[PDB]
Enzyme design. Structure first.
Site, PDB file in Angstrom:
ATOM      1  N   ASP A  35       0.846  -1.187   0.000  1.00 47.01           N
ATOM      2  CA  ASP A  35       0.000   0.000   0.000  1.00 47.01           C
ATOM      3  C   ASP A  35       0.883   1.238   0.000  1.00 47.01           C
ATOM      4  O   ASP A  35       1.344   1.661   1.064  1.00 47.01           O
ATOM      5  CB  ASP A  35      -0.888  -0.022   1.236  1.00 47.01           C
ATOM      6  CG  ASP A  35      -1.797   1.175   1.323  1.00 47.01           C
ATOM      7  OD1 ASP A  35      -1.910   1.894   0.308  1.00 47.01           O
ATOM      8  OD2 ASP A  35      -2.400   1.382   2.403  1.00 47.01           O
ATOM      9  N   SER A 199      -0.672  15.542 -12.032  1.00 49.92           N
ATOM     10  CA  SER A 199      -0.889  15.185 -13.419  1.00 49.92           C
ATOM     11  C   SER A 199      -1.140  16.443 -14.238  1.00 49.92           C
ATOM     12  O   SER A 199      -1.676  17.436 -13.740  1.00 49.92           O
ATOM     13  CB  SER A 199      -2.100  14.244 -13.522  1.00 49.92           C
ATOM     14  OG  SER A 199      -2.480  13.962 -14.849  1.00 49.92           O
TER      15      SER A 199
END
Length: 330
Positions: A35, A199
Site C-alpha cells: 500500500d 498530473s
C-alpha cells in the site's frame, strides 16, 4: 541488494493485489497488500481477536526465534474506506522477494474491522508511503522500504500491476524490459506523507487532451481512480446510460456498454487506461448495472491514482533524497 516479488489480484475484478512476505525465523509467509498510501506493516496474528479471523494466515511471534516485543509500542490506523485495525508491535526479520530487513517493525493486530475479517485473502498490509505517516506510538517506526533503502542498489521500488493478471514489485532496480518507451519522471510532494504529484491533464476516449493540473497520490492500496467531479462527469457522459447513484455510492453504467479509454498526463507524456480496466462488474450478483472504475474524489479531500490508473503503467517510486515518481507505458 535487490528484491523482486510477484503480486497477484485477489479476485477477478482486481479489487486488490497480494504479495507474499516472509516474516520471522523460520519464515512465516503471509500475503500482504502493498500500500503506497499508508506506512504501517501490520498483520493478522495469534493475538488477533479470534472472532475477527476468518481464513487469514496469521503471524505467531512466539514461534519466531528472531521476534522481539517492542516494549510499550502500540498502533492504530483508520483507512480512507472506513476500515481500521490496531494492536501491539514486534520487531522481526522481514523478506520480500529475496530482500531482507532485520529489525523491521511488524505491527501485530489485536483488533481488525469487519472489512478485513471478511476478506480471507489479505493477511495484512505493507505500507510504502513515507514513514512520517506510521502510526506506532510512542516511537514512530520506519517502513520496509525506508529500512531497506540504504542497502539497495538504487533507492527505488517499482510497481507493475497487472490487469486481471499477476504483476511485480521490484526493490532496488528498474527492470528496463518491463516497460515500453521511456520513463517520465515528475515531482513529488511529501508534505502529506504520500507519493503526491500533479498530473498535467486528461482525455476521454479519442477526445482532445485537456491540459489541467490534477494533484493526487499514487496509491497502490486503493482500487479505483478518484478524480475531480468535473473530470469524472466528462468521462461518464461518454457512456450511454451512465449515472451517479447515491444509493449505490458512485457512478454506475449499463453492463452492456463498451467503455472508452481514459488518458492521464505525466508531464508531456500520456498514460492510457483501456476502457475495460474501468469496468468493476455488476453492483450485485446478477445485476445489469455495473460499477465504474473512475469515481469522484469530491467527498475524499484528495485525488487518488489507485490501481485502475497505476496498472496501466510501470511506476517508479524513487526514494532519492528528493523523491520523484516515474511513469512508463507498458
Amino acid at each position: 541488494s535487490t528484491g523482486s516479488a510477484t503480486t497477484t489480484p485477489i479476485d477477478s475484478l482486481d479489487d486488490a493485489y497480494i504479495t507474499p512476505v516472509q516474516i520471522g525465523t523460520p519464515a512465516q509467509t503471509l500475503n500482504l497488500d502493498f500500500d503506497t498510501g499508508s506506512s504501517d506493516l501490520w498483520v493478522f496474528s495469534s493475538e488477533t481477536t479470534a472472532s475477527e479471523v476468518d481464513g487469514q494466515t496469521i503471524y505467531t511471534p512466539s514461534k519466531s526465534t528472531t521476534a522481539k516485543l517492542l516494549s510499550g509500542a502500540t498502533w492504530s490506523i483508520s483507512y480512507g474506506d472506513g476500515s481500521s485495525s490496531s494492536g501491539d508491535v514486534y520487531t522481526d526479520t522481514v523478506s520480500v522477494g529475496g530482500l531482507t530487513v532485520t529489525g523491521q517493525a511488524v505491527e501485530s493486530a489485536k483488533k481488525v474491522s469487519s472489512s478485513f475479517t471478511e476478506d480471507s485473502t489479505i493477511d495484512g498490509l505493507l505500507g510504502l508511503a513515507f514513514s512520517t505517516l506510521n502510526t506506532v506510538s510512542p516511537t514512530q517506526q520506519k517502513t520496509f522500504f525506508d529500512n531497506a533503502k540504504a542497502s539497495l542498489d538504487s533507492p527505488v521500488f517499482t510497481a507493475d500491476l497487472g490487469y486481471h493478471a499477476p504483476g511485480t514489485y521490484n526493490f532496488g532496480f528498474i527492470d528496463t524490459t518491463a516497460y515500453t518507451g521511456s520513463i517520465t519522471y515528475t515531482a513529488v510532494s511529501t508534505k502529506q506523507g504520500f507519493w503526491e504529484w500533479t498530473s498535467t491533464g486528461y482525455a476521454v476516449g479519442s477526445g482532445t487532451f485537456k491540459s489541467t493540473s490534477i494533484d493526487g497520490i499514487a496509491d497502490t492500496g486503493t482500487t479505483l481512480l478518484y478524480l475531480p467531479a468535473t473530470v469524472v462527469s466528462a468521462y461518464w457522459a461518454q457512456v450511454s446510460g451512465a449515472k451517479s447513484s447515491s444509493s449505490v455510492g458512485g457512478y454506475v453504467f449499463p453492463c452492456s456498454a463498451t467503455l472508452p479509454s481514459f488518458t492521464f498526463g505525466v508531464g508531456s507524456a500520456r498514460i492510457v487506461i483501456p476502457g475495460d480496466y474501468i469496468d468493476f462488474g455488476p453492483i450485485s450478483t446478477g445485476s445489469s448495472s455495473c460499477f465504474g472504475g473512475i469515481q469522484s474524489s469530491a467527498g475524499i479531500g484528495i485525488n487518488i491514482f489507485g490501481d485502475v490508473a497505476l496498472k496501466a503503467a510501470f511506476v517508479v517510486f524513487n526514494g532519492a533524497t528528493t523523491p520523484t515518481l516515474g511513469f512508463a507505458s507498458k
